[model samples]
Target chain A: EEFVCISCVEEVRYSFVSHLSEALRRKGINNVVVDVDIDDLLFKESQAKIEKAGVSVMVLPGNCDPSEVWLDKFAKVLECQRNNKDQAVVSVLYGDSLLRDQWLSELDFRGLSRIHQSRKECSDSILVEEIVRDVYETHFYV
Target chain B: EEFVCISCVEEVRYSFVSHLSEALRRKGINNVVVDVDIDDLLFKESQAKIEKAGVSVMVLPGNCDPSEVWLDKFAKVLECQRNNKDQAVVSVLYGDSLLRDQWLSELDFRGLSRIHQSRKECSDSILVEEIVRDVYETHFYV
Candidate 1:
């Protein structure tokens, strides 16, 4: 058998590369992005991964507006949802070697959709509580 | 109009929100978010209306990640490949809206059973490009 590097095609992960790379690193694996270029967006796919796995966040830069800084707290809310489910959001991030060739340039900014729900346990605080309760009630105990 | 302002949402528009919102503001509608709030996710329902059509991206923060828009782009690519292609990606954004409502407490974090062409398209960007090219060649020209 001949060994071909097959450098023509790139690999795509189901989740974002950064998230998956972070996951792999957490699992004691290093250098997940050896062959890819930093400028290539296939390397930066954490946002897509989060969205697919029912997580969302508010993006903020280091030089972000002070008023807007509080908005980034939504990532905490997403993290809370993941923790509430007894699962890490990054765990939901997939790296099955199936998502390698995807391009960041070819995305539709207008076609994105969202579905938000408030846990019924409380009109207020249960938002977090209900998230856990719901996931457990359905995913495990059901 | 009644104002039911709440603190749950801060729009980010994902990308181009500042310019887009500025454009909208120039048109007289000042009260718009820059991105999307995870809470305001309207499954099948349109969140807000502007002259009969629903508005896109409602939440507002400052930073925007255009890559989050990949799902929609893949979905649009999938839509363009279907047989009975009436439902635009916009309409299908919440394909299982009722499911989202029913499974509100139950998050759709894990992968669903249904076959998603968009998922495949995203998973295999090259295949999507090939199919797209085939569609253009066979369907459009002789």
Candidate 2:
């Protein structure tokens, strides 16, 4: 069975990924993996696993401000995007971000599909629904 | 013009009460005072202002355990209820409490008009709408 790997990067905890992964699985996307923060040591293995899965959805920190330092927090995702250029990739950002326009432009600049949510929409259920909709759409189009 | 005093008693900051008071004001209640905490030194003054206003709404801590100790955090509301028995009083609880049934029964036991909000509904706009609706209803029936 083909798998969909949902990877998250940021100060966000597994709780976010847990909700996301479970929701994707419930949507009938079987064999889903939520690889949270592909650590420096396990980075290579994480990339290998996600590539093997064919689909990767990356959830980046949404609270970033308009600064090089703050945006640097998500630099790892740039590498991931470059590496997984051949695979289906979609990125997500939370609603409370200070640099929303910049983030959106960055995703758009990279020619990536994206999902954005507001603070009120940050609830586990609402967040999961948004991700699922985008995931389905991404999978459908690709 | 009549006044509606919304008092909050909890570890919660004035941010909650601030949003509540502004929303109530926008709903055209005119004179609205959001006295947060009813502090130790200012308790009598707080009670006086609320009584003078003729309408008092109390926002209590919603995240309580089913213990006498945790429940005691809100005992002050009982005194407010007793003192303001002649005026219209509405109570509120956040939806995340462990002692929801116990709290509901207690509010019902005292026969207070109440508003309950889930975590997802904790957004300022959503929380404000619920409170305003209940406040309007309480004023209409009385």
Candidate 3:
């Protein structure tokens, strides 16, 4: 029963979550959770909750000037997850005013691929759909 | 006899400015004002000063989220200058906590290339050196 979660409020609604889970199952994708509610601003705190709830995806807010200590902690957690090779744990980092270079440097260092909110104008639904499509395709091949 | 000026306090001391201007003339770069004083936090205000002083480069404060009105004005000014094909005006946006994506998207929309502050660990002198190198190389070729 492999599951994938996309971070966003609307996408993680009960209806969408159930629908995606069922749809994936029909294609022989077992026990997939397609939706999770995680706000972009509270990502630091939300990450802990998601992890404790046994969800696969890790969401972190990459906004503001992240302190050295905070970055150190983020690196440690990401390292543990990457070592585990958890495919379902899609890492989504989103927010305004990110210290993009520093955060990106860390992500590169840790070899973690994360979905960041794009500046390009696009509907939320379309964005979520693209993410789900990618997840489905990846899972299908694996 | 055209000049391009990049402003910062330490590098803009009177002696250096005079010597650099003199040395540039000898090399035929001519009248380059490599010196002016502008605090990093007041780039917005400083930009106005630079423009009034007839130096081409536009400076924008990157220390915090600039007001929408200010950004709008800045964009308009840059657009006019770019359309005018003013080569002396090299745009440099710097600071921490920039609304990077939004600002960059605006810059792209307006067709502007700016030197953004780097997040990599480097001394101020080294960082400024890289920017100056780029500026020099561009000027040399142009």
Candidate 4:
């Protein structure tokens, strides 16, 4: 099972997250986690397995608190677990250009502050299409 | 080694065809052939291997002799060796919309004359992009 996670949702975004999860599964990508309730990464020592896995985008809302405790912990945990190979963290900061830049500075104290920007135009169709494409591409391009 | 062929050239447009062949091998898709002097299709029991193979787009000149003896034999041999599953054929009929449709009628008399259209604005970049993309995408998405 090639696992991919979509996490850091604000509980209210469960509906959209679940929809995205189902879409990936529909396209034969079955091993995906959307539940932010449990720690799927650390549950089965999944951190080690994720090195060879596909994508795990940290899903953030538009008005997210970049300096918030949960946000900080997630960043630290990703770095701690994956370390130099911790590129699994593609945080989707759903915000404007200026705010998106601001969030990056406050989040990473080190030079590793860049993150994948989430768009206002981002939807299940577009996101799921890329994800499935990536997973399928990874699975086959070897 | 995976092999792909780009053939049915007029022996004049070897420059663009060679350019495309080089582009593919640059991305590590080697074993490709761009020559139309000798038939690569019926050369090395290649027909049998093509069942487990990828694509071989039949490169067509814009003002092609659809009823030419060479083109006719190429079509028949493709249908003969790779019969019932000879879909490796995607002809780039470089023409206007109406002329493009007209070529299909003259070429495919047995109701198997569908072709991929070549464009007025089709350049090396766009054509190679789709061909490499198709090859890569097909190799990956499956």
Candidate 5:
């Protein structure tokens, strides 16, 4: 359809996006994903093919700290809040509850919609599917 | 007033025996504690005073490994199993379940009686007390 999907991920592996992209495809959704200082350079170069298939890609400085600097800069430049409204916002961050809470507050401060919050292991395929399902429901079904 | 007292502890501090001595006094029970290669030199020196006050002490080599070379040597020399009968025998060692199990089998091989086994953090007074209680109950109340 006619929907815009936005996602911000930090310190995640290439496999996280791979699983998520598959999930989005299963739900018949097009998505835009940010490549945030992910460890694998091979995955970053391969994004062109996914981009051609209706997924938009962006890059940001990735670091270990939970207080995200990259998303703030990207959001400011893109004016994501002003331009992208009533579309799905999917955000992911690494680390524990304290880090998640800090990121949650940051998302709130950036005026991003808080549709759902999930704590999941990065390697879990089911978690990726569940997250994509939540985003799909929030965007289309809700 | 009369009760069988048994205990096993690994790398314990000086206060473990001191408090147990007080506990025995409170319970009107006498105790015979082993002076394994526990590091407190003062505790080692004070054994004579404690022995004079009705707490008998036996000596053993203390080290981290599960092989327990010193106790084995002592047992071989004294033939402890042949001599000490029906008296509650307390044995203590260090490391995880595997090491403990190997030591248990070693004790079994030497024909020593196995009453109970405990894994406790030596630094925790309450844990030591709880372990002591378990040993006391196993000997007297069981």
Candidate 6:
């Protein structure tokens, strides 16, 4: 299906990781579907595939340690991810299919690190949201 | 064949100075050949196509002087030419193509490289267009 970015009528490819998995299989590379409970392997493997496929497709929640798993692994991915830490995962993924794997795609990595640290210091998610938004908004301007 | 970057239009100044000049000749320490009266600034020179086509063909007329005449004007140029100089390298052309001699080209190359190391800044109004245009021309995502 096609979705358009409000700023421009650019088509957004909003497909889930499952869709990409299917593509990988079609390409003859078998995907290892490790459960989220298996954080070590799941994230390690996810990082590898994200590099190989040149995309951060979709992130799915699975049983076991949901909050902790995402916080530790994907958070770093988000933390390390070039620009859009505050943006929802889908936006980040679709922003550039090969974004994560590619060399710092136009995002200020230094600013990102500072923003992530600032957001982490906030007491709650609401404060995190406010602080994160403020930082990035000003970052865009300056 | 080492192709040196020339100018980056929108950036106003580039890490690569657009035109090559006698200044470059001094820096490169490479001598240039002149076919004209050598003394005549406006007179017609030799018709050798190779000389015309070559990059470091022209010799700087002894009368002309080179210096940091930019004074306060160079902030933008210096910044544009910085190593992490976010500016782009614009068009590519042989040294003599734009100037009377290649000495200026040598000087230009030296000046840009010096600016890169010196961390000088340029006028935002003058350089912003070139910088902005450059950002658009470069495709960050693969």
- In terms of lDDT, the best-performing candidate is 2
CAPRI classification of candidate 5:
incorrect
Residue B90 lDDT in candidate 3: 52
TM-score for chain A, candidates 1 onward in order: 0.21, 0.71, 0.50, 0.59, 0.58, 0.27
Q: How should the candidates be ordered by TM-score, best one leading?
A: 2, 4, 5, 3, 6, 1
Query: Per-residue alpha-carbon lDDT of model 5 for A58-126, expressed as tens digits?
Result: 222223333546444345323443343333344454332325556556666855544333343222344
lDDT of 4 by residue, A1-142 (tens): 5556666554423333544455456566654444344465564464443344455655565465656634544553354335435344455554333266556765465334435444553433344445556655655236
Q: Please compute DockQ, using alpha carbons, for every candidate against the native two-chain complex.
A: 0.04, 0.04, 0.01, 0.01, 0.01, 0.01
lDDT of 3 by residue, A1-142 (tens): 4444333333223322333343344455554232233344545554443343223443345563445523433443443344335444555444434567766675566566655442332323233345456566766565
Model 4 chain A weakest lDDT span, ten residues long? A10-19
Off by over 4 Å in 3: A1-142, B5-55, B66-69, B72-83, B86-89
TM-score (chain A only) of candidate 4: 0.59
Which residue segments of model 2 deviate by more than 4 Å? A1-142, B31-39, B66-73, B81-86, B95-98, B119-124, B140-142
Name model 4 segments beyond 4 Å from true: A1-142, B10-13, B37-53, B69-73, B80-87, B94-99, B106-115
Model 6 over residues A1-142: C-alpha lDDT tens digits? 1111111001211112222333334334344322233355555655433333222223322222333434443444544234433332222212211223221222243232222211222222232233324323443223
What fraction of native interface contacts does model 5 preserve?
0.00
CAPRI-wise, candidate 2 is incorrect
- Candidate with top TM-score is 2
TM-score of every candidate relative to the true structure:
0.17, 0.46, 0.32, 0.38, 0.35, 0.18
The sequence of per-residue lDDT tens digits that candidate 3 reaches over residues B1-142 is 3455444333223322233233334344533332233343555544443443223444445443545524444544443343335455555554434566665665566566655453432222233344555555666655
lDDT of 4 at B107: 50
* Segments of candidate 1 deviating more than 4 angstroms: A1-142, B1-16, B28-37, B40-51, B54-69, B72-142
Q: lDDT tens digits, residues B12-124, model 1?
A: 13212222233233333333331223323451132332212212221211122223432422222222224333211111111111233332222122122221122322322
Model 4, position B25, has a per-residue lDDT of: 69
Locate the minimum summed-lDDT window of 10 residues in model 2 chain A.
A10-19
Model 4 shows how many backbone clashes? Answer: 0
Worst 10 residues of 1 chain B by lDDT: B87-96
